[PDB]
PDB file of C-alpha atoms and ligand atoms in Angstrom:
ATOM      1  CA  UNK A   1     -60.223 -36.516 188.215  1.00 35.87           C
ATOM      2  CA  UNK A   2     -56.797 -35.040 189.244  1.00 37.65           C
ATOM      3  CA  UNK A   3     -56.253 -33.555 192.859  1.00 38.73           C
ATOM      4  CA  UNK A   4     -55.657 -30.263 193.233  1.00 37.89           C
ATOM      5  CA  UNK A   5     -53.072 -28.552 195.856  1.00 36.58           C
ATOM      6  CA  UNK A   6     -53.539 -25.337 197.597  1.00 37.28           C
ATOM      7  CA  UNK A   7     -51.932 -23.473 199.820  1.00 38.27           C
ATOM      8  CA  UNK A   8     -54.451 -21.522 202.110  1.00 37.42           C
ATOM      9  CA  UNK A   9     -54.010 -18.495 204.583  1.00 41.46           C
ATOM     10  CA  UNK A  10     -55.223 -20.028 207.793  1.00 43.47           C
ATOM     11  CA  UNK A  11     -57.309 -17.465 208.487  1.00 41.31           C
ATOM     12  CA  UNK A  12     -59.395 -19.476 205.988  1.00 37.75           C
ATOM     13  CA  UNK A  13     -59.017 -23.072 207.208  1.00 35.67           C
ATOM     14  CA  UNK A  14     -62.596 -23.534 207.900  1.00 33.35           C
ATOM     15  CA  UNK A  15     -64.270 -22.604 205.427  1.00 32.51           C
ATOM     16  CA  UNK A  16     -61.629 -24.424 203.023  1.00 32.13           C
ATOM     17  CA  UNK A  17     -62.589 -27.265 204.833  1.00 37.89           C
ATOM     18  CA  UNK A  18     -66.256 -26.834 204.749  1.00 39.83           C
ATOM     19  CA  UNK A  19     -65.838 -26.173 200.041  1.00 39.17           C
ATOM     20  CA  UNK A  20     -63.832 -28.650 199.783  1.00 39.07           C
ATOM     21  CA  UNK A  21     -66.301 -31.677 201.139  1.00 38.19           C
ATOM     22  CA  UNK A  22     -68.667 -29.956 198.546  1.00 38.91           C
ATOM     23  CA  UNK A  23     -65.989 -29.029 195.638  1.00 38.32           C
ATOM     24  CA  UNK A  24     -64.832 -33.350 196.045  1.00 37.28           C
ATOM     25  CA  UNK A  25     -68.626 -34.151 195.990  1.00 36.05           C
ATOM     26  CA  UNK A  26     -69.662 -32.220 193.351  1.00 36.91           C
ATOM     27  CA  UNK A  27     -66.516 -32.628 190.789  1.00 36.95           C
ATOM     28  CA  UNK A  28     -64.726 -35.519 192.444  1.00 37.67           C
ATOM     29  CA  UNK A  29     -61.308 -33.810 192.184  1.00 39.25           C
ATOM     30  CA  UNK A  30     -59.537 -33.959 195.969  1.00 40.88           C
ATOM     31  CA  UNK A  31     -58.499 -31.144 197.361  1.00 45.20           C
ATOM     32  CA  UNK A  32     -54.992 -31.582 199.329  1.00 43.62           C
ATOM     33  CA  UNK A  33     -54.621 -27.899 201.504  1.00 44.15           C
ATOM     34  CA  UNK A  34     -51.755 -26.408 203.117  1.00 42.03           C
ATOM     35  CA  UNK A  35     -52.636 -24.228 205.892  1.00 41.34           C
ATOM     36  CA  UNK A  36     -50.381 -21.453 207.296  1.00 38.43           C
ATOM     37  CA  UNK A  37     -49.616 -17.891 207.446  1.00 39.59           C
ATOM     38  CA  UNK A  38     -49.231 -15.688 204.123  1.00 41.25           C
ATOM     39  CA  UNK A  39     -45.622 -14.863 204.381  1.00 35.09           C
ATOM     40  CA  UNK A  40     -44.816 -18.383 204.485  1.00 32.21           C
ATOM     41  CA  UNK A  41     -46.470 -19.458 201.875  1.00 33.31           C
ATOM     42  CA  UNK A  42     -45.121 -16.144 199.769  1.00 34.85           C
ATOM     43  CA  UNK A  43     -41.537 -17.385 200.907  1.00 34.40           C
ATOM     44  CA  UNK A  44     -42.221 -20.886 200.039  1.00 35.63           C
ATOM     45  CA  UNK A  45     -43.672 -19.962 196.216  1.00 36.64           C
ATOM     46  CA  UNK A  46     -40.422 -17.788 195.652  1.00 36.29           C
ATOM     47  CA  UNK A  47     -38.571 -20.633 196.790  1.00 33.44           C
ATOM     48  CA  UNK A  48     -40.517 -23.371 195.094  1.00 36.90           C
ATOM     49  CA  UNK A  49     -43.564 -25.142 195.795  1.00 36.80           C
ATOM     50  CA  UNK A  50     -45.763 -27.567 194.409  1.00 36.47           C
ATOM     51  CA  UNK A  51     -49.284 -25.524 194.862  1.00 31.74           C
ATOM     52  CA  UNK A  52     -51.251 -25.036 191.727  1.00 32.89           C
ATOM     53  CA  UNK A  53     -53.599 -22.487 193.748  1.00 32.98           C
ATOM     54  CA  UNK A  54     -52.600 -19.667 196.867  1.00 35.10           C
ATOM     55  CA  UNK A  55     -55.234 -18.511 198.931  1.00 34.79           C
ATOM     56  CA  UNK A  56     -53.891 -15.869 200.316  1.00 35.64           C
ATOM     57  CA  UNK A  57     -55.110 -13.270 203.491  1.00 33.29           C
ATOM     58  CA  UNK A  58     -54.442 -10.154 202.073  1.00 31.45           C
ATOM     59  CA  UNK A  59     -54.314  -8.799 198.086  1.00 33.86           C
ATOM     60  CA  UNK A  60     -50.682  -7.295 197.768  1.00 31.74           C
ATOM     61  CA  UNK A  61     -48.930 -10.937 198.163  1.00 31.45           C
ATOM     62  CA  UNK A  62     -50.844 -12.681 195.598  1.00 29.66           C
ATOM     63  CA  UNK A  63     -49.741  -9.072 193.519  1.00 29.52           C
ATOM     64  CA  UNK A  64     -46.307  -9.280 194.216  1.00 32.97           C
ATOM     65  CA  UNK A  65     -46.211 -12.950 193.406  1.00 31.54           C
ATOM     66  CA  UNK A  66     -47.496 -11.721 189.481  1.00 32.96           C
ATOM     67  CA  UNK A  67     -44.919  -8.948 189.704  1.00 32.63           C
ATOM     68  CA  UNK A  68     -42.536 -11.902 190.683  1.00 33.35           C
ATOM     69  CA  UNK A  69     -43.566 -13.892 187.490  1.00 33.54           C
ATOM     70  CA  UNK A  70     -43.842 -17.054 189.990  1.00 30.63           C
ATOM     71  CA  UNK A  71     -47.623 -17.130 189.672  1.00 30.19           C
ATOM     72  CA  UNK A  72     -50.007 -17.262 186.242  1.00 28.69           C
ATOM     73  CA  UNK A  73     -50.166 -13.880 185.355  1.00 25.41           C
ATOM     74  CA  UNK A  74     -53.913 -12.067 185.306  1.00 25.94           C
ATOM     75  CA  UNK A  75     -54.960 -15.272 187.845  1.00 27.81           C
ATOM     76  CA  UNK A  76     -55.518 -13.238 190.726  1.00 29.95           C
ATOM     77  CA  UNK A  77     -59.271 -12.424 191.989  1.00 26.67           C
ATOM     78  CA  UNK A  78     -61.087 -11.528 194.950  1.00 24.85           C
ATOM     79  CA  UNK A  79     -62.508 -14.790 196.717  1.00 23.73           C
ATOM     80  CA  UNK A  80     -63.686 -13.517 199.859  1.00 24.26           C
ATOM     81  CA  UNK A  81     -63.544  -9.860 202.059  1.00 23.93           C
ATOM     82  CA  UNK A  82     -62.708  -9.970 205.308  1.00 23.21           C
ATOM     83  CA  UNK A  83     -65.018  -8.323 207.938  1.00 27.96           C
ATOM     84  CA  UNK A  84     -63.799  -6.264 211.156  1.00 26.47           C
ATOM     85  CA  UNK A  85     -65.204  -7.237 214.609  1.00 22.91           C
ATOM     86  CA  UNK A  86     -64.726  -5.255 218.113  1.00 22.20           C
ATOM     87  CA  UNK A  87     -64.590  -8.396 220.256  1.00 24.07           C
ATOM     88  CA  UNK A  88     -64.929  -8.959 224.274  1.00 25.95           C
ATOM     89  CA  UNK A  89     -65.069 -12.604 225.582  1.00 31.31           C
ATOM     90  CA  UNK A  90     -67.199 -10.973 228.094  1.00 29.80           C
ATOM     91  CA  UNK A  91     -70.630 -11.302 227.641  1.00 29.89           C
ATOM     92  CA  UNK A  92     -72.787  -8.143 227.553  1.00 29.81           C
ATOM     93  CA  UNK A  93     -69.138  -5.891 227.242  1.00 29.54           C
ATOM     94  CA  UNK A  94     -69.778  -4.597 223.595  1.00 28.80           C
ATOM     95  CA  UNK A  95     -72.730  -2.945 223.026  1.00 28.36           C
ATOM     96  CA  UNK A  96     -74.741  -3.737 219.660  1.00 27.78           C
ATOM     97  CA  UNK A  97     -73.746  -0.396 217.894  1.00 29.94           C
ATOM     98  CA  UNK A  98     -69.950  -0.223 219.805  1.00 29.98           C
ATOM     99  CA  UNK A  99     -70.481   2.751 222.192  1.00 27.55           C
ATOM    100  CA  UNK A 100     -67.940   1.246 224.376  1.00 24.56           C
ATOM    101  CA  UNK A 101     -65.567   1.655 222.248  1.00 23.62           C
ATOM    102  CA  UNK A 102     -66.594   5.168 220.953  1.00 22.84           C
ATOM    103  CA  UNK A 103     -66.751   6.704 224.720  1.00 19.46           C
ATOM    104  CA  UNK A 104     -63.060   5.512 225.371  1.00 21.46           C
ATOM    105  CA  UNK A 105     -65.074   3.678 228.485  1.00 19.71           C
ATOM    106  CA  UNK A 106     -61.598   0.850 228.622  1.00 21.09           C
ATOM    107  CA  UNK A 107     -58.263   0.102 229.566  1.00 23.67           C
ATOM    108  CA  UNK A 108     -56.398  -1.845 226.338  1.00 23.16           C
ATOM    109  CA  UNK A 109     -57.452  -1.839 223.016  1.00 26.46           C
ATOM    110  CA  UNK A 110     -55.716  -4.896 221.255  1.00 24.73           C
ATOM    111  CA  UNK A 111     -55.068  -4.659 217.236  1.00 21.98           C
ATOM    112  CA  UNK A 112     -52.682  -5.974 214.451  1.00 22.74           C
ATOM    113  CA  UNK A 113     -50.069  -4.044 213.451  1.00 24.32           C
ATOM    114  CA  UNK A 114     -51.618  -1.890 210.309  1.00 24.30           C
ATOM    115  CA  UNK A 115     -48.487  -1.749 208.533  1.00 23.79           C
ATOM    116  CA  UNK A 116     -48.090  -5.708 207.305  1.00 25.07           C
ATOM    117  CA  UNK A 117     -51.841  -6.910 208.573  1.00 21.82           C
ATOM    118  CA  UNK A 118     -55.338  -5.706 206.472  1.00 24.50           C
ATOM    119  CA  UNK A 119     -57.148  -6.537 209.487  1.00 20.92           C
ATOM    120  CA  UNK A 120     -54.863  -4.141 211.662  1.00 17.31           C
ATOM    121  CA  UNK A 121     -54.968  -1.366 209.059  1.00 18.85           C
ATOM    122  CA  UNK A 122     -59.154  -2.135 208.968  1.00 22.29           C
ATOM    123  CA  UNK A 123     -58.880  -1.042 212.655  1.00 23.94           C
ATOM    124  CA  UNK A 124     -56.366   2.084 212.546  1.00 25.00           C
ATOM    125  CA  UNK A 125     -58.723   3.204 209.482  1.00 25.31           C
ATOM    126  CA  UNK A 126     -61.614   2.810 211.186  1.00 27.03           C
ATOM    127  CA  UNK A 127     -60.015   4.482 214.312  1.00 28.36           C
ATOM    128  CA  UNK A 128     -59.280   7.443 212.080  1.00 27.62           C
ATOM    129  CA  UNK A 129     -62.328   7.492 210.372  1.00 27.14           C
ATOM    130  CA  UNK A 130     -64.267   8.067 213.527  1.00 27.45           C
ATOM    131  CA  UNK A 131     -61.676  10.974 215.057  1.00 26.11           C
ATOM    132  CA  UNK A 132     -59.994   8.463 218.133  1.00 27.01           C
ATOM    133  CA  UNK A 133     -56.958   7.536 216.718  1.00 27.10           C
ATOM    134  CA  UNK A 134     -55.158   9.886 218.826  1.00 25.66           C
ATOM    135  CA  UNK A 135     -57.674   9.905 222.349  1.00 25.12           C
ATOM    136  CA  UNK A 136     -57.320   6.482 222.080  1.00 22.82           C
ATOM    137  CA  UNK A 137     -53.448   5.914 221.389  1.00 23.32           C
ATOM    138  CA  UNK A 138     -52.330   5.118 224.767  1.00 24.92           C
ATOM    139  CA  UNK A 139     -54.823   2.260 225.214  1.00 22.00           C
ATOM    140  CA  UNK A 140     -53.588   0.189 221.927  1.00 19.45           C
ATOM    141  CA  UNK A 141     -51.782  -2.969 222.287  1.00 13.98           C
ATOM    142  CA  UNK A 142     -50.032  -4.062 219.096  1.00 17.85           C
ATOM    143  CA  UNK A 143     -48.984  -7.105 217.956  1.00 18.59           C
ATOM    144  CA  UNK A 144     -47.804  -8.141 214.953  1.00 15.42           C
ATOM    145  CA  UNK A 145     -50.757  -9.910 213.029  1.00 16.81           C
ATOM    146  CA  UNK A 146     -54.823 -10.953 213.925  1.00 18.02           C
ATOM    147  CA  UNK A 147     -54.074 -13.536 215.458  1.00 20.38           C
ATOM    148  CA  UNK A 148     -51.886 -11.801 218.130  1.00 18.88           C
ATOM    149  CA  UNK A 149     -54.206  -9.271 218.067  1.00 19.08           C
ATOM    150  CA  UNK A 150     -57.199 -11.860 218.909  1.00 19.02           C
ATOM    151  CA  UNK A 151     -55.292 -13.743 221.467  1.00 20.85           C
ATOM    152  CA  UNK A 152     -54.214 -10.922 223.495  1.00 21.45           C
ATOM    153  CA  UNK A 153     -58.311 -10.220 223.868  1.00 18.71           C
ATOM    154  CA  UNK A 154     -57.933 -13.454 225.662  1.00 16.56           C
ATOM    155  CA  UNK A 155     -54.945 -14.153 227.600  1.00 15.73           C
ATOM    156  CA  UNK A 156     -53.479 -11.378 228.109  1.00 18.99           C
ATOM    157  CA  UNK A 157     -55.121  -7.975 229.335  1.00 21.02           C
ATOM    158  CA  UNK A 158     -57.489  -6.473 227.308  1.00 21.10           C
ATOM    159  CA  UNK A 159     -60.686  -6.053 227.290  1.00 19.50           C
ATOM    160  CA  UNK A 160     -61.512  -5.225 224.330  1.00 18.05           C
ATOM    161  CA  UNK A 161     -59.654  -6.133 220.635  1.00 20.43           C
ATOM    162  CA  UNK A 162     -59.992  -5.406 216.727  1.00 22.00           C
ATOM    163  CA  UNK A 163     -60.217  -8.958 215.198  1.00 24.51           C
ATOM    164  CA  UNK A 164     -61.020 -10.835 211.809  1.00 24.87           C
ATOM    165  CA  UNK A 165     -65.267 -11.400 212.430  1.00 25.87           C
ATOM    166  CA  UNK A 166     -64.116 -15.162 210.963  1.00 29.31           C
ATOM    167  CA  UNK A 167     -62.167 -15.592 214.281  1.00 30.08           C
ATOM    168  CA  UNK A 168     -65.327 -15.512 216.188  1.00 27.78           C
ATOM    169  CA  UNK A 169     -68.023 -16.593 214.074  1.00 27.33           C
ATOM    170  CA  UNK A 170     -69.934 -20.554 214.063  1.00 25.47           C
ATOM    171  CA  UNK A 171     -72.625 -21.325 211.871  1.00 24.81           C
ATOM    172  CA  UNK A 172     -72.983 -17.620 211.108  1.00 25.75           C
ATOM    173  CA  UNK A 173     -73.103 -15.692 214.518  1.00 22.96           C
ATOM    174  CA  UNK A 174     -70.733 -15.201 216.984  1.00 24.31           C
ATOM    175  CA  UNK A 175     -69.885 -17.894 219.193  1.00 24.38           C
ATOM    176  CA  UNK A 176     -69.229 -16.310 222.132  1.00 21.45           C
ATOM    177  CA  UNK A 177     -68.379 -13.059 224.467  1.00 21.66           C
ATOM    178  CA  UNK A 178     -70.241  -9.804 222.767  1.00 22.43           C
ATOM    179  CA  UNK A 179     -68.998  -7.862 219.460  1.00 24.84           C
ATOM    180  CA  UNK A 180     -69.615  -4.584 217.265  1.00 25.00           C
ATOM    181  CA  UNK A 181     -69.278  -5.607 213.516  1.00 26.29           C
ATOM    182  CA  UNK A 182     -67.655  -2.312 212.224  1.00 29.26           C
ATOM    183  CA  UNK A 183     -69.520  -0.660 209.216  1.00 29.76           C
ATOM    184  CA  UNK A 184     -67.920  -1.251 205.396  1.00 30.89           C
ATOM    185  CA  UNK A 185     -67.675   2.732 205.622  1.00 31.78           C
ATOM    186  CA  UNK A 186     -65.063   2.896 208.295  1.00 29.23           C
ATOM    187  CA  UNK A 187     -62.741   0.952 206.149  1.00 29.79           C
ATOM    188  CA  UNK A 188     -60.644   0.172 203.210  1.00 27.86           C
ATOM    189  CA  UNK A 189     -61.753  -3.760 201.765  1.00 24.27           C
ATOM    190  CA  UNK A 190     -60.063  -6.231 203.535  1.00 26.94           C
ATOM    191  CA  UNK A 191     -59.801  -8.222 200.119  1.00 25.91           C
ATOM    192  CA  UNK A 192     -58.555 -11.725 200.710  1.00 25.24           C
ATOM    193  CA  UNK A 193     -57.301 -12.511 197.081  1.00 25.89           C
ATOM    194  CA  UNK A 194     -56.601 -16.452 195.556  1.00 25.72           C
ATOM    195  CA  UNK A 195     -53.969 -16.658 192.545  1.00 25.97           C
ATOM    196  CA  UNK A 196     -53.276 -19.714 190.190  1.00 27.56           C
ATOM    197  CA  UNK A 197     -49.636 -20.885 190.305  1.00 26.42           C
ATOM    198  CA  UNK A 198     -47.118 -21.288 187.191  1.00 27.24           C
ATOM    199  CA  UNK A 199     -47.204 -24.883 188.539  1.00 27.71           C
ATOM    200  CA  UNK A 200     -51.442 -24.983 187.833  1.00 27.92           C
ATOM    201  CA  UNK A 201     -51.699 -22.848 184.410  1.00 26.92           C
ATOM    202  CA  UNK A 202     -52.673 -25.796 182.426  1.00 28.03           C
ATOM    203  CA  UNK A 203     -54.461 -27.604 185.365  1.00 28.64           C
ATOM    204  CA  UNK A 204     -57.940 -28.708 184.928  1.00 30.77           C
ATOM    205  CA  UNK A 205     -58.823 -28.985 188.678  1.00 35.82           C
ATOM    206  CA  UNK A 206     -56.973 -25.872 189.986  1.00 33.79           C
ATOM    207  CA  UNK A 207     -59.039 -23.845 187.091  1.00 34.96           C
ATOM    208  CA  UNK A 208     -62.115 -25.629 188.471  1.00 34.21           C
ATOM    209  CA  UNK A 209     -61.344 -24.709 191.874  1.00 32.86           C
ATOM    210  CA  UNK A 210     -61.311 -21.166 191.208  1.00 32.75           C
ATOM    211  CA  UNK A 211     -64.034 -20.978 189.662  1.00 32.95           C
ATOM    212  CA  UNK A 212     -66.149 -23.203 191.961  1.00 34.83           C
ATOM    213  CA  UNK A 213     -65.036 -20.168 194.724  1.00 33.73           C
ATOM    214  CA  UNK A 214     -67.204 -18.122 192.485  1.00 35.54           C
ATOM    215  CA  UNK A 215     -69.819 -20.125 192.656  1.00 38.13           C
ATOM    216  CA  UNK A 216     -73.264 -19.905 194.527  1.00 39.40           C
ATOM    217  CA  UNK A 217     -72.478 -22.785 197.130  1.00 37.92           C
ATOM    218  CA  UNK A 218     -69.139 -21.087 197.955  1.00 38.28           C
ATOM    219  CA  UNK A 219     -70.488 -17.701 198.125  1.00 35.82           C
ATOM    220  CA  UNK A 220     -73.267 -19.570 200.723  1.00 39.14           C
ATOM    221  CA  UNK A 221     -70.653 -21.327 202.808  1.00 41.12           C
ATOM    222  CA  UNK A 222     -68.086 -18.032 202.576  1.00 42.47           C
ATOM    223  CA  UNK A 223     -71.053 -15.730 204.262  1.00 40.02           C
ATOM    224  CA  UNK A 224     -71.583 -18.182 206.907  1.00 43.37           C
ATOM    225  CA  UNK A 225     -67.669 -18.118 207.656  1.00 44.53           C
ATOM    226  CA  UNK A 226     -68.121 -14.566 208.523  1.00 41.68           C
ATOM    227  CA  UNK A 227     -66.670 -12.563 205.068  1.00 45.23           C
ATOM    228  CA  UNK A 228     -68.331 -10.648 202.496  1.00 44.58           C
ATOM    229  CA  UNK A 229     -68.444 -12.448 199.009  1.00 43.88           C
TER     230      UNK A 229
HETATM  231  N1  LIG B 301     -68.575   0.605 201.916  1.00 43.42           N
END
C-alpha cells in the first residue's frame, strides 16, 4: 500500500492530521503532508514538485494550476467550505447575532485583504451585503491574508477581526474569546478546492485519498474542524 504525498494549505493542518490517522487505518496507505501557504505551494508545482495531491485554501489556484496543464486535468473538486467568524478574544465582546459589529460600537476592525484572500473577500462581501462597507471604512485594518488578519485580533489593536471559523474552533465550538458566525447569505462560498497532480494521475493512493475526502468520516471530522462539507 503506496504512500501518498500532499501538499496542504495550512489553514487545513488539523483536520489533515485528524483524516489521515483514519485514511492510514482504514486503507493502510501513509499519508506524508506538506503544510504551508497556497502561493507556495502554487510556486512550487509550477516549479516542480513531487505531490500527487494539492489541497489548496482557495478554488482559483487549483484552476489556474489546470489552465497551467501542471495538474490532472478535470481533478479539481470542492473538499471543504470555509466558514466566516467575527472574533474577540474577549469574552462576552461579540454578541450571539453580531450587533456589535452592526452598530459600529468599536475602534479596529481587522480583515484579509479581499483581493488575494477568500476569507478577506467573505468579509468585504459581507460588509457590503449589510450596507457598512463605507460607515465602517475607517475602522478596517488590512493585512495581507487570515492569518494576519487573525493575529492582529490578538497582538496588535483590535478588538474585533473577520477570521477563518477553523482558526478558532476545538472539538467543534469555539475555543475561546466570543464570536458571530456570519450567515452563508452574506457571502460568496469560500470553496477550499483539492486537485490531483500530473505526478498522481495513475496513483492508486492519491485517487483513494480524494475520494476518502468525500467520504462520510471526512465529511464528520471536516464539520468538526469548523467548514461546511
Ligand atoms: N447561502
Amino acid at each position: 500500500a503506496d504512500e501518498v504525498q500532499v501538499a496542504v494549505a495550512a489553514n487545513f493542518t488539523a483536520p489533515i492530521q485528524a483524516i489521515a490517522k483514519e485514511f492510514e487505518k482504514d486503507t493502510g496507505h501513509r499519508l506524508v503532508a506538506a503544510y504551508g501557504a497556497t502561493g507556495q505551494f502554487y510556486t512550487q508545482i509550477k516549479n516542480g514538485a513531487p505531490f500527487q495531491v494539492f489541497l489548496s485554501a482557495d478554488d482559483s489556484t487549483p484552476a489556474k494550476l489546470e489552465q497551467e496543464g501542471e495538474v490532472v486535468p478535470g481533478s479539481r473538486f470542492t473538499y471543504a467550505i470555509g466558514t466566516l467568524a467575527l472574533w474577540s478574544p474577549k469574552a462576552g465582546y461579540v454578541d450571539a447575532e453580531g450587533e456589535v459589529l452592526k452598530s459600529g460600537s468599536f475602534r479596529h476592525l481587522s480583515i484579509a485583504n479581499p483581493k488575494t484572500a477568500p476569507y478577506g473577500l467573505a468579509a468585504t462581501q459581507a460588509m457590503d451585503k449589510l450596507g457598512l462597507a463605507a460607515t465602517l471604512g475607517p475602522k478596517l485594518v488590512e493585512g495581507q491574508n487570515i492569518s494576519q488578519a487573525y493575529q492582529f485580533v490578538s497582538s496588535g489593536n483590535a478588538e474585533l477581526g473577520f477570521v477563518a471559523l477553523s482558526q478558532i474552533y476545538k472539538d467543534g465550538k469555539v475555543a475561546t474569546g466570543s464570536a458571530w458566525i456570519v450567515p452563508t447569505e452574506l457571502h460568496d462560498p469560500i470553496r477550499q478546492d483539492a486537485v490531483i497532480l500530473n505526478k498522481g494521475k495513475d496513483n492508486a493512493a492519491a485517487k483513494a485519498l480524494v475520494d476518502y475526502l468525500k467520504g462520510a468520516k471526512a465529511a464528520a471530522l471536516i464539520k468538526s474542524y469548523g467548514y461546511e462539507l
